[PDB]
Symmetry: C3
């Protein structure tokens, strides 16, 4: 009955995200990974590449699917008919941001719940941004991302 | 006591508005100092941000609005204000405000820095989130004054 | 045989940085100030200028030297044969970011320690960004930076 939507830029999706998704898949009947077009960031990967990578990482989860969107989250969730937003908390500064996003979404989409998970301690500290920067300088990122994602970063950077 | 409330106000929100109301009832003279903040790349021009702030505060006889592009520590002296007002709603706001205040204390030692918190009803409102939501056609009329809402509507088309 | 590497953008180096360097100098045999290119922050000063300013500020310390680098920190520190990273802490948001940086470097360079110092309270409130913005507006920053840095910032904005 619960359809949960996990929105993010996922540039690229990391094991941090992956941990939260494994856990959300075992908790909800239907999990939608919502990859946001985020042009105000100049994402390393195109929307289509980021959707593809997230699918690759979650294809073994039958109740998890991936979609891209460029519209307002509060609008888009209505198109997906999800009644729950999922957001991750890894740092105390995440909570502040998520707190204001949640209360703001509460005004725009009053019938959608905002819930949070924190990733396991092994998969905390993983920044999508730091993964990009490390990969860009030829550092090994295989401990932070799925092999398919690792392969994509390598190819992306020559 | 002449209080100066500096900010980008891009645009001014109900959070700012709450604090201004409260400061109006507390001080003889309240100056809203709208900073040209070129590095934030403001959605609204300085002139637009000043006009909106004026519109939102025109019912308050002891509150006036000025734009400035100069150093705050210099500008507050030109305005002859002896108090800075800044809002606090999140702890990351506090650290930044703490650091700005101790540095202004070095640049303007005779000026006091004080803080207010908006009511919980406006506590969660970010000017940034208001811009982004409006940019995507989300309704932001509950986060801002009617004149600001119109301005946001016209701003994107 | 402790060699400490202090990485940062230093755009420009401040009294905040200098305090940590003074202290690390009395604590370690060899102190390396690693100035990062950081092209993505679009630094006000070029890498060479930033190295030069750092050199000027630290020339009275016999066991301290300054180098520029554009490579992965985790690679560069091994290249320097340093066994310790030094990072400064002034606010809790720094701690969050540094905590996460330390844990990802620990994966990339497991034999390198991450240690932290906090500056004396007189220099704890000093931000290089704020120094830049104040100077760009013709404000006096001489109590926040060494004279050579003050002079360089003035020339930079005219
Ligand atoms: C939630 C949402 C609104 C904001 O996007 P976001 O949360 O900042 O992006 P993410 O969900 O991937 O999480 C933050 C990520 O962006 C990166 N990031 C953090 N701060 C950043 C900054 N100033 N600039 C660019 N990127 C940043 C980080 O790397 C972080 O990823 P990481 O934690 O894995 O390192 C977006 O997911 C969304 O759904 N947009 C739809 C638009 C909408 O409905 N409203 C606009 C305001 S709600
Ligand atoms: C102090 C000052 C630089 C910061 O701008 P500010 O608006 O007062 O501080 P902020 O309010 O931006 O801090 C966070 C808030 O702004 C938003 N915000 C902060 N940084 C932002 C950024 N880069 N981009 C977009 N939005 C931002 C957030 O939404 C948040 O909420 P709010 O806008 O509703 O108030 C500006 O007010 C000022 O007074 N400048 C004078 C310049 C000067 O004399 N010296 C420069 C160094 S002192
Ligand atoms: C990781 C790193 C960014 C940390 O160093 P650092 O934080 O920049 O060190 P500094 O004290 O000189 O600079 C800090 C300032 O940069 C600011 N800053 C951080 N990210 C920024 C960004 N994208 N854009 C602009 N300013 C930024 C911070 O707000 C901070 O401001 P403040 O100190 O005035 O308050 C980098 O400098 C480093 O030490 N090693 C990088 C190695 C690597 O991974 N790649 C190197 C290739 S260049
Ligand atoms: Ca600094």
């Amino acid at each position: 009955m619960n359809r949960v939507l996990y929105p993010g830029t996922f540039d690229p999706i990391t094991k941090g995200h992956g941990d939260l998704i494994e856990r959300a898949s075992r908790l909800f009947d239907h999990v939608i990974i919502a990859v946001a077009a985020s042009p105000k960031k100049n994402p390393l990967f195109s929307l289509e590449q980021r959707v593809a990578l997230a699918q690759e990482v979650t294809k073994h989860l039958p109740n998890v699917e991936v979609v891209g969107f460029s519209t307002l989250l509060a609008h888009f969730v209505k198109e997906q008919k999800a009644n729950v937003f999922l957001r991750g908390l890894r740092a105390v500064s995440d909570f502040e941001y998520e707190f204001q996003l949640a209360n703001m979404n509460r005004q725009l989409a009053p019938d959608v719940e905002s819930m949070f998970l924190t990733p396991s301690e092994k998969y905390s500290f993983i920044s999508s941004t730091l993964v990009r920067e490390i990969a860009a300088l030829g550092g090994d990122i295989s401990k932070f991302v799925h092999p398919a994602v690792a392969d994509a970063l390598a190819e992306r950077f020559k």
